[PDB]
Each structure stands twice: as C-alpha cells, then as structure tokens.
Amino acid sequence: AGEILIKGGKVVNEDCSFFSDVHIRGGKIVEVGPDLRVPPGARVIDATDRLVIPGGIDTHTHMELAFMGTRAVDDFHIGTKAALAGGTTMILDFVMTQKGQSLLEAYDLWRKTADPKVCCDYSLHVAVTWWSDEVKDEMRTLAQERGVNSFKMFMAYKGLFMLRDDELYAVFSHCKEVGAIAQVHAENGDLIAEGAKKMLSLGITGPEGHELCRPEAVEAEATQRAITIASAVNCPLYVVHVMSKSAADVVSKARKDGRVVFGEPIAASLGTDGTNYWHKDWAHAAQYVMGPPLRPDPSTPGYLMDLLANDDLTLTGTDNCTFSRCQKALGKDDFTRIPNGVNGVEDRMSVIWEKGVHSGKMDENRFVAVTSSNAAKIFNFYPQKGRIAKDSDADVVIWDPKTTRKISAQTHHQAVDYNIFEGMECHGVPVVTVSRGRVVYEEGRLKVSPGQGRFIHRQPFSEFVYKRIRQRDEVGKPAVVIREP
Amino acid sequence: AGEILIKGGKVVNEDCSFFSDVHIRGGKIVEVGPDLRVPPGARVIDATDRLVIPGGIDTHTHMELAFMGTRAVDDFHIGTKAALAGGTTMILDFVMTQKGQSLLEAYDLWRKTADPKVCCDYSLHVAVTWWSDEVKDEMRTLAQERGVNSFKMFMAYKGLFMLRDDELYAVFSHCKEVGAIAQVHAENGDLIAEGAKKMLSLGITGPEGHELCRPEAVEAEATQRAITIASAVNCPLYVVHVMSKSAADVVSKARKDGRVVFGEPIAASLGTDGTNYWHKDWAHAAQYVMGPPLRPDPSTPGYLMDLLANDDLTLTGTDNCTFSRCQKALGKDDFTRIPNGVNGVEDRMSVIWEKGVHSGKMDENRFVAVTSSNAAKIFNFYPQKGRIAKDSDADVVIWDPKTTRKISAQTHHQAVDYNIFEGMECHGVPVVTVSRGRVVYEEGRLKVSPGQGRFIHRQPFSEFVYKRIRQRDEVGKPAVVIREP
Amino acid sequence: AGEILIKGGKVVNEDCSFFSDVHIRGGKIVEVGPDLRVPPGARVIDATDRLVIPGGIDTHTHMELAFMGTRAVDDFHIGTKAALAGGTTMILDFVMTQKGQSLLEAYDLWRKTADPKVCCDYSLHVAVTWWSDEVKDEMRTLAQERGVNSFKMFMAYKGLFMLRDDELYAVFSHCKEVGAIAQVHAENGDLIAEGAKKMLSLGITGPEGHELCRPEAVEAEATQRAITIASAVNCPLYVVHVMSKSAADVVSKARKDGRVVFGEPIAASLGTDGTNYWHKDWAHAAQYVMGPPLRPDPSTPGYLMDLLANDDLTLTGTDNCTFSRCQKALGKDDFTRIPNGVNGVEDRMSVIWEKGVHSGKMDENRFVAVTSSNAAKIFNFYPQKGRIAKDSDADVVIWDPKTTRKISAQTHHQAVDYNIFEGMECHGVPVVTVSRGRVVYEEGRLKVSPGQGRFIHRQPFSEFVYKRIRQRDEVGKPAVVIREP
Amino acid sequence: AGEILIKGGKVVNEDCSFFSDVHIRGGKIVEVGPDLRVPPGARVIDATDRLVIPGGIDTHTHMELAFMGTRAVDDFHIGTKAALAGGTTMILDFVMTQKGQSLLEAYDLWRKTADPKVCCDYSLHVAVTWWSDEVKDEMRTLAQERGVNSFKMFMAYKGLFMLRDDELYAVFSHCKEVGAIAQVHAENGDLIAEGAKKMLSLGITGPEGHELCRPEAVEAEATQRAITIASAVNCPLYVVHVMSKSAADVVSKARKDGRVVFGEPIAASLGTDGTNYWHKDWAHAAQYVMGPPLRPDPSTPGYLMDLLANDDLTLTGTDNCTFSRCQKALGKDDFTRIPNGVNGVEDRMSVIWEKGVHSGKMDENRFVAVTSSNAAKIFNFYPQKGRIAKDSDADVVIWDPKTTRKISAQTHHQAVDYNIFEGMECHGVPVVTVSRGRVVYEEGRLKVSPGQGRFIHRQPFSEFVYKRIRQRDEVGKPAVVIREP
Ligand SMILES: [Zn+2]
Ligand SMILES: [Zn+2]
Ligand SMILES: [Zn+2]
Ligand SMILES: [Zn+2]
Ligand SMILES: [Zn+2]
Ligand SMILES: [Zn+2]
Ligand SMILES: [Zn+2]
Ligand SMILES: [Zn+2]
DSSP states (O other), X not given: OOEEEEESOEEEOSSOEEEOXXXXXXXXXXEEETTOOOOTTOEEEEOTTOEEEEOEEEEEEOTTOEETTEEOSSOHHHHHHHHXXXXXXXXXXXXXXXXXXXXXXXXXXXXXXXXXXXXXXXXEEEEOOSOSHHHHHHHHHHHHHSSOOEEEEESSSTTTTBOOHHHHHHHHHHHHHTTOEEEEEOSOHHHHHHHHHHHHHTTOOSHHHHHHTSOHXXXXXXXXXXXXXXXXXXXXXXXXXXOSHHHHHHHHHHHHTTOOEEEEEBHXXXXXXXXXXXXXXXXXXXXTOOXXXXXXXXXXXXXXXXXXXXXXXXXXXXXXXXXXXXXHGGGTXXXXXXXXXXXXXXXXXXXXXXXXXXXXXXXXXXXXIIIIIHHHHHHXXXXXXSSOSTTSBOOEEEEEEEEEEEOOTTTOOSSSSOOTTTTOEEEEEEEEEEETTEEEEETTEEOOOTTOSOBOOOOSSOHHHHHHHHHHHHHOOOOOOOOOO | OOEEEEESOEEEOSSOEEEOEEEEETTEEEEEETTOOOOTTOEEEEOTTOEEEEOEEEEEEOTTOEETTEEOSSOHHHHHHHHHHTTEEEEEEEEOOOTTSOHHHHHHHHHHHHTTTOSSEEEEEEEOOSOSHHHHHHHHHHHHHSSOOEEEEESSSTTTTBOOHXXXXXXXXXHHHTTOEEEEEOSOHHHHHHHHHHHHHTTOOSHHHHHHTSOHHHHHHHHHHHHHHHHHTTOOEEEEEEOSHHHHHXXXXXXXXXXXXXXXXXXXXXXXXXXXXXXXXXXHHHTTOOSSOOOSOTTHHHHHHHHHHHTSSOOOBOOBOOOOHHHHGGGTTOGGGSOOOBOOTTTHHHHHIIIXXXXXXXXXXXXXXXXXXXXXXXXXXTTTSSSOSTTSBOOEEEEEEEEEEEOOTXXXXXXXXXXXXXXXXXXXXXXXXXXXXXXXXXXXXXXXXXXXXXXXXXXXXXXXXHHHHHHHHHHOOOOOOOOOO | OOEEEEESOEEEOSSOEEEOEEEEETTEEEEEETTOOOOTTOEEEEOTTOEEEEOEEEXXXXXXXXXXXXXOSXXXXXXXXXXXXXXXXXXXXXXXXXXXXXXXXXXXXHHHHHTTTOSSEEEEEEEOOSOXXXXXXXXXXXXXXXXOOEEXXXXXXXXXXXXXXXXXXXXXXXXXXXXXXXXXXXXXXXXXXXXXXXHHHTTOOSHHHHHHTSOHHHHHHHHHHHHHHHHHTTXXXXXXXXXXXXXXXXXXXXXXXXXXEEEEEBHHHHHOOGGGGGOSSHHHHHTTOOSXXXXXXXXXXXXXXXXXXXXXXXXXXXOBOOOOHHHHGGGTTOGGGXXXXXXXXXXXXXXXXXXXXXXXXXOHHHHHIIIIIHHHHHHTOTTTSSSOSTTSBOOEEXXXXXXXXXXXXXTOOSSSSOOTTTTOEEEEEEEEEEETTEEEEETTEEOOOTTOSOBOOXXXXXXHHHHHHHHHHHHOOOOOOOOOO | OXXXXXXXXXXXXXSOEEEOEEEEETTEEEEEETTOOOOTTOEEEEOTTOEEEEOEEEEEEOTTOEETTEEOSSOHHHHHHHHHHTTEEEEEEEEOOOTTSOHHHHHHHHHHHHTTTOSSEEEEEEEOOSOSHHHXXXXXXXXXXXXXXXXXXXXXXTTTTXXXXXXXXXXXXXXXXXXOEEEEEOSOHHXXXXXXXXXXXXXXXXHHHHHHTSOHHHHHHHHHHHHHHHHHTTOOEEEEEEOSHHHHHHHHHHHXXXXXXXXXXXXXXXXXXXXXXXXXXXXXXXXXXXXXXXXXXXXXXXXXXXXXXXXXXXXXXXXXXXXXXXXXXGGTTOGGGSXXXXXXXXXXXXXXXXXXXXXXXXXXXXXXXXXXXXXXXXXXXXXXXXXXXXXXXXXXXXXXXXXXXXXXXXXXXXXXXXXXXXXXXXXXXXXXXXXXXXXXXXXXXXXXXXXXXXXXXXXXXXXXXXXXXHHHHHHOOOOOOOOOO
C-alpha cells in the first residue's frame, strides 16, 4: 500500500477551505474528514499550520525539446523532479510535430522519451503544424484512442509551424468535430518575420531587438483573429502564454462577450517583465528571450495577475523550455538565433502565491483554481486531479503560506544555470510534495525515480469546455427567411 | 425521520455534474453516490432524466412590506409557498428599519412576523437608514448575536432612507469592523427627486415618467460612487438589483480592477425590459414600476445575462415586492404614487434557465452558482446550502431542463394578480421541491405549513467575502517616507 | 466670367459660422464679407435664411463599375448629376485595377471614361490588387505624376482582389515611401469565403445569408489587423465603409492610442440598418446587399453617428455602386451572385443632416467637417475645397436646414430604380448647388453638361496625414543597447 | 499706430499651416498674405524659419490668490509678464468668491486688483461657492453685463467651497438658463476630508499623505457625477485640471457618448507626475502639492497627452497658483497646511510642444488648437483670438520649434523660487511675443507695463458650446404616452 495520513492541516479547494485530515491509500485520497484514525503502519505527515492543496498542474511545458537546433536542458526526468520540488505534480507537454511528419509518430516518439523518465504524472498536447487528410485522420485517432483532447496551432513561425487563416478555420472545425480544444500560439508570423529582418538591418542584434520586432500589438492582433475564426466555427479556444496587457484584454473582452475562450498567462509573464531585454549584460538579457516576448511595460505582470484573479484569465502554465547560458549564446551576434524559452516549472507555485495571494489580488481558493483545478477541468480529468476529496488522485502538497523562500539558480532544482526570478523572495513554500500517493519531496529533498510518473489518458468533449458549445449547436443554427421566389 | 432517496438523476453542483443518488435523512443530505440502497420505509423520488440541484436561494425579497403606504400582497406565508413552487428553497428578506427607529426592534418585528409564517428557510438583511452611536451599537449586536452579516444602505429615497457620502463612509467603515457586507441601493437620490418633480411639471404622469426621471446614468453614477467609497475604507460591497447595462459595466470594471464588489441582477432585469412603461394600457405599464426601473433598451436583459454568465455579475435575487393591480392604481394620476415593486420569487429559476442556459449563455453548473451557491458563500452558509453533498441541508430540487412551462398569472402561486413574465415559455421546470428534508412540492401541488421554515442564523466575516479584505489590511497599509524635518 | 454674388446667408465652415456674402468670379470665391457690392451683370443668389456651405465631397464612389459581371447603372454622367442635386460637388471614385493588370492602364481607362462625362469635379483612388516590381513602379508614377495619393487594398474578395498580411506589409511600406495614404477594405476574406459556402450548404440563399456569413466580428478583426500592420511600418491608414459598431470601436481605440488612422462610415451605415436583409420581399432585401453588409443591430447607425460627431470616425462617403432591381435579381437563387452595392451619392448630405444635426448629435460646423473639409485635408486639396474663403474653389451649396424633403426613388435623380432610404423625411435641403463657379442646380432643376467637371490632380504627402508620420520617423527610431560582445 | 510686419515665417492655425506675412496695425491683424509691402515706419520682425502662431491662452490661473491663509507670489503683474515670456498672451483667472459673499463684489474686487496690473489681455471665471436667490441674480448680471460666461463650482473643499448634488443641479440649471458654461472642480470632498484625517492619524504628514488621501478614483468618481448631473439638466460642462488617467477616461467616454463636456488637463499633469511626492527632500516634494494631486503612475502625463492629441481632452491651462519655498513650509508638519498650487503659466507652451509635438503625439495645428483656439471658442471670442487672420487681435508668437531651452527656476520669470519642470529640455521656444499689436518680448527681454493688458468682456451662449445644447432642447423633450385614464 503505502498509507499516508495528512493530519492537522487546512484543506484548500477551489470553492472553500476547511480543517480536515486527508487519508491516502494506494494512490488515491480515500477519506477526508476531521480527526481521522491512524491505521497501524500508515505514515503521518503533520500539516499543523499548513495548507493542504491539490498539487499544481503545469499546463504548458517543453521538456528536452530539440529546437533552434539544440535541445532544452530540463528533460522529462529533471524537469519533473524540479516540478515536484516546486509543488507541481503534473505537467502537460507539447508534441512538436514537424511539418509533413505523422502526428501519431511524433506522439509515439514523445511517449517513448517521457514514459521511462517522468517522476510525476503527465499528459500531452499535439501540435498541428500542417494540414491534410492524413492529419485529419490522425487527429481523430489521437482524440479517441491516444488520450489527447488538445491540439496546438501556430499563427507565428512562418515557414516552420505557421498556418494561415483558411487552414486555421479547417483545423478549428475538425477540433470541434473530434471534441478537442484548440490551443493557439497567437502572434502574427508575417509581422514577426518582417520585424526581425528590419531590426537586423538596423544593427539591433541584441535581445531588445527580439521584443522590438514583435511588440504586444502583434500578439493582440493574432489573439483577436484566432478568437474570431474559432467563434465562426463554434470551436472552443485556448490561448497559450498570454504575455501582454493588450492580448489579455482581447481575451477578457471575448469572454464577457460569451466567446468560449480561455487565456493562459505563465509564470514568466506573472513574475517578471521585458525591461530585462535592455540590460547592459548580454547574457542576462538573453536569459529572458521567448516567444512571445516579455513586455517592457512594468505594470504588465501585476495587470495579468489582476485578470487572473478576476477570471478574465483562467489558468497557468510555465512554457518551461530551458537553455543554458552557453546555449543562449548561439545568438550572441543575432537575436533570431537565441534559442527561445525560459524557466518556471519549479517556481510557478511560489511565484503565483507571492504575486497573487500575499499581495491580496486573489484568495487561496482562486489560487487552487488557477494552479490546478481549471487545468483539470479543461483538459478533462477533474475532480480526479485538482481537488482534495475522496476518490481523487493523491497528488497533494503541504503548503506553508507564511514562510518565504528566495528563488535562486543556486538552490533551484532545474538543469538550467540561471533563473529569470533570481532573487525573488516569495511567501508560500511547498514543504511536502505527495505524488501518486507517495512522498516524493520533503525537507528540501527529493525521493523519486524516473518512470515513477504515469501518462494520463483523457477523453474528448470535456464538459467544462463543451456544454455551451453543444447547446449553441442546438439553438444557434442560422435560419432561412421563408419567401415566395 | 422521513428518509428520502432521490434515485436515478444527475447531480449538478457549481463545479461539475455527475450521476448519483442522494440519500436524505432528518433534514440533511447524509449520502451522495451511485446506486444507493433504499432503507425500509424511505420514500424513493425517481429523478431519472432530471437534474438534481441545490434549491434556489433568493437573495432579495420584501414579503408583506408596508411601503408607499400600503403592504405587498405576497406575504411570508404565500411568498415562500410561491418560492417553493418555483424551485426556490430560501429567501433573504430586508428589515426596512425606519429613520430614527431602533434596528433591533425592527429586526424583532420582522422575526415575529416571519417565523410563524415561512414555509421555507430564510434569513434577513438589515437596512441602515440613519446613523448614530445607537445604530453603530445595534449593528454590532446584529452581526455578533442575531445572525445578520448584511446591512443595506440607500443612496436614493431622499428624506426617507437616503444617506449622504460622509454617512456612507462611516457606515461602510463600521460594516468592515463588524465583518458585515455592505449592500447598496445605488441611485442618485437628488437626481431622482429633481427628475420626478420635472416629469410631473411636464404633465408626464404615466409610468414612462418613472423611468425617464431616472435613466440608467443615474444608477451607473451612484454605483461607481458606492464602489469608490467602499474601496476607500476597504469595505466589501454588494450592489443589489443591478437593472442596467451601464451600471453592470461599472461593477464589471471595478471587479477587473480587483475591487471587492458583487453585483446582483434580478429576475425582472434578466427576463423583461422597460419598453413596457410605454404601453398604451396604463395598468400594464404600472405593473413594471420599481426602483431602479427596468430599461427601455431591449438588449439590456440579454447583456445582463452575458455578464452573469461571465461573472462580471455573480448572483441573483428577485426584489419580490408585489402590489395588486388595484394597489398599483394608487398612482393612476401620478407615477410617484405607484407602489414600487414587481414579482419574481416564483419564476426566477425558470426565467434564468430559459434565458441563460437554454440560450447557450451559461452552463448548468454556472446556473447553480448564480441561483444558490454564491448567495450561500457571500452570506456565509456554504456548503450548508448551495451544494449537493454529504452533511449539507437537504434543500434540493428535481429539475426538468427539457420540458417547458408557460408563465402566467393564471397558473402562478403568487398572491399578485398579474405577472411581468406573462406568456413566457421557459425550458426548465421544478418537478419536485424538497425543503429541510421534506417534499413540499410535487405534481403541481404544494404540501407545506406556515412556520415549517427556519430562520438561518449566520456568522460575520464570511471567508468568500473577507479573505482578500484581511490580507489587504495586512500588506496594503500606506507607508510614510522617512525624512529629516 | 459668370460672376455670382451669394447674398444674405450664413457661412458655415468647419471652425465657425458667420453672416457674410460670398462673391464668386471665374470658378473661385474671390471675396467673403458683409454686404458686398453687386458688380453690373453678376447674378445675385439670395441666401436669406439659408446656410452657405462648402459643397459635399463624396470620398467613395464606384460609378459604372463592371463587377459581378455587370455594370452599375449610375455612370459618371448620371451619378455626378445626382450628386449635384443632393448638394455634393465632388466625388472620389476607385480605379478597380484587375489582378495582373497595369495600374497605369486602369488609371488611363478610368480618366478616358470619366473626363468626358463628369458634371462635377472628381478625383481617383487606385486599387492595388496585386504586387510586384511593376506595381511598385506604377504606384510611384501615380503618386508623383498622375495626381493620386490614395491606394486601395482589399483584405476580402479571395481569389479576386485579396492581399495577404505579408503583401499588405510590403504595399503599406511602399505607400508610406511615396507619401500616399493606404485605404483598406477591412474584412477577413477567408472567413467570408467559408461563411458563404456554409450558408449555401444550409439552404440559406436569401440576402440574410449574405450578412450571416460575415457578421461584424469578421469586419472588426480585419480592421484591427490592418491598423496593426500599418502601425508596424508607420504608414497612415484609411478604413473605407465602416459598417459596424465593433469595427468603429477598433478605429476609435486605435486613434485614442495615437495610431494614424481614419474611419469612413457611409450614408448607408449612417441612415439605415441590416434588419432589411430579413424582409419577406426578396427584391427589397437584396436592395441592401453590399460588402461589408449593413448590420441587424438597430442601434448601429445612431452609434456610428455618435462616433462621427465625436471624431472617432472622421469623414463620409457613400460607396455608391448601384444595380437596378433586375440586375440584383441575378442572385435570386444564390446571394453570392447578387451584385453588391447600394445608392447614396445623392442623399448623403440630407441623410447626415437629418440623422446628425437635426438630432442634436453634431453641430453644423462638424457637419461641414465630415462632409467636405476632412476629405479635402486627407486627400490633399484643402482649403482649395471644403472651405468658404477667398481663393477657394467656388463649389458651394445653399442649404435650407429648416425644411424637410422625403427621399424617394420617384423623385431622386439616380439611375437606380429604388432607394435604400425610401420614405425618409430629412431636415436639410440643397436649394442651390454651385460647382466651379456655375449654378448647376436650382429649383429642383439641374443645368449642367457631361464633361463640365474637372479631374483634380493632387500631390503626395498630405500634411494633415503625414506631419505626425514624419516626426515619428525622426524621434521614434528604435535604438540599440550598447554592449561589450 | 505702431505698425508691424511679421515677414518670412509659416503661419500655423488650428486647421492648416501656410507661408505668409502678417501685417499688424493698431492692435489688429489687418492682413495675412505672401510677400506683403513694408509701409514706411513699420517695424519688420523677421520670422524666417519660425512658426507664426496665435499667442497661448491660459484658461486657468489664480494670480495673487489669498488662500490657505497666505497669497500666491505670482501676482497679476509678474504672472502676466511670465506668461508673455513663455509665449502666452492671455490668462483667464478665477474670482474666488467666499461663502456668503456677493459674486459682484468679488468680481469688482478682482477687476480693481487686475486691471492696473495685467501686462497681457485677460478675463475672469466666477466661482459659485454658495447658492441663493441673490447668487442666482448675480450670476445673470455677470453673464449679461460683466462679460463672464463661465462659473466655477467645487465638489471638494468641504466646509469651504463645496456644493452638494442638489445644489449642483440647481446651479447647473441656472448656468444653462443664462448661457454660461459650468466649470467643475471634480473631487469627492467627503472622501478627501476623511482621507486626510486618516493619513494624519497614521502619522503620514508628508506630501505623500496628500496624494494617498485622495487617489485618482476619488477624482474619477466626482468627474462622472458632475457629467451625470450636467447631462440631466442639459447644461454644458467643463472639467478643470484633469490630473489622472481614470478621470480623463470618464470625460473621453462621456464625449464619445455625445455628452457636452470638455476636459482641461494642465501643464503640471502633462509635464511631470506625482512620484515627486515621495521624494526624500520634504521641500522638493511639497513643491508639487495641489488639488487634485499629480499621480504616482509614470504613464499618466504621456496618456493625458495622447488624449489631448485625440481630442478626448480639448484644451489646456496651468492652474498657476504659486507659493515660495518658505510659504509651502507652513505645512512642514501637516500636509493639509501646505498651500496648494504649482507653477506653469510661463512654461505651458514649451512643455506642451516638447511632450506633444516633438514626441510625434500631435501636429503643430492641433497644438494651436489646444493652446489657444479651443479656449477662444469655448469662452466666446474666436476668431478674435486663437487665429492668425485678418481682423483678429494681434496676439501673436514667433515660435522656434527646432531649438531647445532648458527650464529652470534660475532663468524663469515667475516670482516663485523653484519650478516643477526644473531641468526639462524642451524643443519649441518663444522668440518674440506680440500682445495687442506691441512687441512685449524679444531676445529674452520683456518690454511691457502693468496695466497695458485689457479685460476681455464676453457674451453668453458661446456657439461652440451651445448649438447642440439648443437643438437638444428642441427635439429631446420627453413625451407623454397618450392614454385613456
Ligand atoms: Zn508558443
Ligand atoms: Zn510553448
Ligand atoms: Zn432597492
Ligand atoms: Zn429591494
Ligand atoms: Zn469595399
Ligand atoms: Zn467601395
Ligand atoms: Zn481646482
Ligand atoms: Zn484652480
């Protein structure tokens, strides 16, 4: 078995908080209630003065992705260990299928690479980077048989991943047909391409060139465009890594307007800003380069946190895609060659608690919502995860909201040799992490093996996502006016 | 006992829906799960093809209020029966304390009148219609000992209930001190007073004069003003009967801005509009007169439903305050003498389901949120009510979302002899109502006695309301700059 | 000569109004002042009780355009006569160059067709419907030698006129280089194409299908996209025929944000709405079909007038492109074959005065601004036109704001056999029209010959348009951060 | 006479710019045109490479006001000299009538003090700081006989100037009756009073306490409230010293909504921000104290400039009300005793040109609009001032837009011994100032005598202000529905 009894703490779910013990057996929470009995042999974790919360679910990772030709240094093994140490018990990673390549083969390739290495549970989104009868069939197979209800499309990366409006329309339509959610990288790829070419010709080769060639308008525009196409075919839409105030306002307006869309800010865009691209030290500046870029407006992260609190934005990931200082350096003479991506998987939970809860922007319950419950709802395994209740998976974190910890590349568990949150003092510390009913992290120490985590197979037509979509198919059909010829 | 087993239906809570039976014993839900056993003697309600939902909680009623000198015809007895027949299992009624009168005496007077008559559970808000050391003391007593954490203040009704900005400030401050929520009637009382006087001098004595003398700008202005004062003292605010698009946009903006404020649209403003004040038939027009008025912009109710779906607005009441056709007629020659108030207590649930869920604006779960769960959170008895789960009160409705019913004063259970929703065909029918663990309504028939309902005593410092408030008291203190003299 | 003295009236310019006579000689206003002398032989027009205003300038016409294969019935001859009778003294018509066809040849072809026929002054925009070194050269020639500083690009009409984002970028850049303004037809051509295909498959072949396949979101999206691309290259942008509230709000927001963009609502979208597409009578419905379509939201025209008054929108045209009832009928079985376009050239001035000035939305001076002065500023001949002052062209209208006239296809001077403003009673009547210093219209009668009007040759780099653009090229250059390697 | 010929420069009016000489005789511009003849004895000012512009009109000054009991150090004599040296040729100063004091006596008192001292033209607004039959009569006398069409009301300064909503309503109504414009100090006086009391009790006595006790929400709220009351009585409204983004957004929204309201940002709020209140040096911080306060959001001045460019805000003043470092010091121990007010009269023109025109936010023509033309329109003497044209007053400035000057209390002409724009380098220098047809400022030297300026007597019912108001009285009357009893 391994039986665990978490005693003395306060359970925090999305809807409310209450004092209770949590009894874990065989991978599951089998009971929640006051003063539970300790069965002989069960380990007691003492949660007196702690919050007992669902482990974090990182909706957005790229572990060991080969990109910009090189591969991210946090791999499935180290990345998941780092997640665990930061209070995160599941990651959802993106299968980056290449143009013309089979989606199934790319899927197979990701499972073979991750299955023997994950230390926590995980699941996969699949990128749709080209279109054809074959892609259409493979998307159906993926949604019905391979446990994947999320497909990722790119409006940027011209020549590489980009799809045009007419292909987005076709792809979005077929997502709706197989009951998947459509995820979008929302930047105008034509403007990025022209922007970068122009920055280079002006001799602006540094990281400030990366942000200047694709300011937030270029994100906001594609965000609106994606919502418009999706709304036209009644397909549910998910906007990954919202980085800017204007793009977040597009999503906030579309939702007030009843559009079925979700916005996902990330740790990076909630915890720091793009003024770093202007840093005198090239290496420092290049640490922050990712697409879309962090924004030079200092009010951005606080504004994004306010919208996250208010549910204009709904859940969080990290877009963790790390490259060491010596890999970033591939672009020392040309910012278009800096491999894009920052850290976050480990620090997301503390970063959000410090910037969101300690600051008085959201309460502990909205915190649980935006770090696990909503991910589980949208990707279709709630309340299996994202909730502390009988029958749920025992992915649980004992959380100390009153103590602080400073984030540093010197004490973090990620492979990358720097940290975009370097120096930040955060209230909220994961003191014990439980994953699949086992104590994988306690007293600063990890105790877990590569392969201990499991792939989570999901069904299509997530209810949280589809109930309005289906009712609209029923009563929102356009009608003819009846006329003599 | 009276044991009941609700079998075969689909439970709908705020967060998700799932197939399960519900076992009720002695006033409580004692078990929720698949295929429960029928203990000998328990009555089985067959919920096959039905939704099993928390009974509705009407946040806003005025049963048998003596006003405009006369009294509303739906009293505590008939009003609660009508609630039950419409799927609503609790009402929160307002103690309308007069100027200079003790709040405790008015409280006592309301309990004595309602206790022997309610057929469903209820609770009370208390209006603070004047200010002084005595009112200050009585508010504390009410919050700590009389089960009341909501106080109602008026920006309209000059000479009668109105408080000025400096008194709102003092009152709002003391609400925060005793852990109450501040509710506001948000209209500019000076503009109403001048507006009405002007409409009369122009010979516009009909109901169109009532709306024209206080168009929605006059509501939006006071709504902003109330949020500003409340935000200044860090007091949580609740805006009752939001009737207009502009006033709802004020609340939507304040919340995106992190203000602690809740907006409460009502059945009336979600189900019909103010074009009715322009009806040729005087009696018809006067049916709709209430303050603030319904709006002549036909897009209003749909817009309010969109904001309710998106959580710019958060919960619903009815402001049920009814006067028969012959009482309305007191103002046949002068609209200022029409006793203000419309129906809704009975029809709220069906009205919202038809306009909100059937239309594809919100799903069944957000429906539960906005008809019971949020009321229970804000007024501080969740999940005791507002949720189908073990240990919760057995206030449950078996709901048929596929069948329609037409609303008519000929078939409704309210005392009033007309209905502002006359003729409306609504999907969503309450087929069985259970209150306090007893079947009080089934097959169109009510089975309940005056006095069967209970007053619900609440504690102050509702967590849903106060957790952000208290964290802001801790880290939002303004700080001095340290200076040589 | 032909000398004219306009005596006794009140001159209305964009900035103010004042009593004065206007002395016209040889095509020009040669004096403006109180009580001028009548030189022997000069004709006196008595303007007592009238406004004396600059003649209207219609920024947007398609006289006798061969399209959807057929040609509009108002040709240069009749269209300009109709303009004159409605108080409009200049039109700007679009050279609809076909894909792969020389822009110069299309220009030549338009001048040859219009020069011998116009009864009032005119000028031309040229559509850029494809891209290449040749188009690039011809645009320069057009701007420097052929009197054209406005180029028109299409985001709709896939396969026919449409340009993609990367071509818009290149085209917009070169517009800025030759000092032209970029005009855009802002609708997403991919969504229109898919929308229409879908409406047809659903058997919705009527005009309601035309609007439903491209609702206002599809306009708003392309409008934002165009502003974003234009802003990226610092190119001034002009959005033709704004038809919807949401697309007008995009332009209003971009301008508050300092973007150099102008929005042009038209008579149609200021004077009627798209509820007409739902008319039982097919012929009636099809009268209103144009791209983008009129909108079924009845508050649209009033809202557009409010933004026009407030300068969120800046000037007006008509998009006059008329087809007789028997030509519309080409699409009786399929709305995609209804030749697109409505009337307006003649009625624009009265329509705007009734809906804008009589209604109290704008004053007579803003009226002059939005019917002539702004057109002259943007297209680069102010104050040569658009102002009543010494040395300006004598294109003048004597305007009666107090009398009304009803618009009817029975009394209008347009070739088309119906009128989208049929029945409208408008305050504001053009009693005398003067064009090029000659009385071409008086007492309901026209007195003018085809060819009497002149092509107006303009220079590039309009100051109204370019002064901010050029200052931004000077101080808005992105700068490198100076770094050790 | 004194004849002057300004030769060789470029005339910049509100609508366009063009090369011409300007011939001045006897106080008036008597001719504008190319290459004018120099009559024997006329002085030639060589304006080669310069802009020739209408002199600035400062809509908002308090010269030598006795306040907070002490009097401002820039008096009518020095203040107007300083204006002249900064390119400003007229000021409009406020008669600060005390509570219970006759408005006529206060008017008389201001004219007697200013008439013998002004060096440039001026006019007066009159504050209405109490209400009664007498105030009502005196307002009529002022508007019809004393040349004053602007009355100033206070929503702040409780106990001192403040009027409540019902008095604002009555006052605003009577302004509309006498054809005046209503000006408002828009802050909630109750919140200020409570805010200050609270800051003091918390030991925050420094200038940061002044801003913290009345953050921008408190301005935005009163701004909305004033617009709402004014709109209710159809009275035109003018919001003085808009200091914040949120209050400017209230005015921007009300105007898009067709409300007759004008917003007036000032030099202070366009040129610096409230972060200065947090300065370690007490004397420095207190320099910036005025009501409402400058805002600690650094994006404020740029945002206000963007709205000024876009005409969400329409014209500028300075609220010049200066107190020397040793007078400010009256509040060294309590910020409520710092005499409120900053400098600006002299620097407004250069500040706006640097921040507005050089930055590429507005062009030179919009600059003229917002520094003179709009003031003249609203207060009812355009084009007598605010325009370079025949018959206009010769108040003219020769402006060098390419040269910069640094602003410093060491080189400024104001009496006050510091400058809130200290150190700012501004493009745009007034090289020659002409007032009433005389060269009063050239080569850094002033040549003018106290009393040389004249009071400008205005008429009521300014057309720019009233034409929409009057049309709305005609067609916006509310109508009765016709009904059998
Ligand atoms: Zn991405
Ligand atoms: Zn990513
Ligand atoms: Zn009320
Ligand atoms: Zn009420
Ligand atoms: Zn077009
Ligand atoms: Zn067109
Ligand atoms: Zn003031
Ligand atoms: Zn002032």
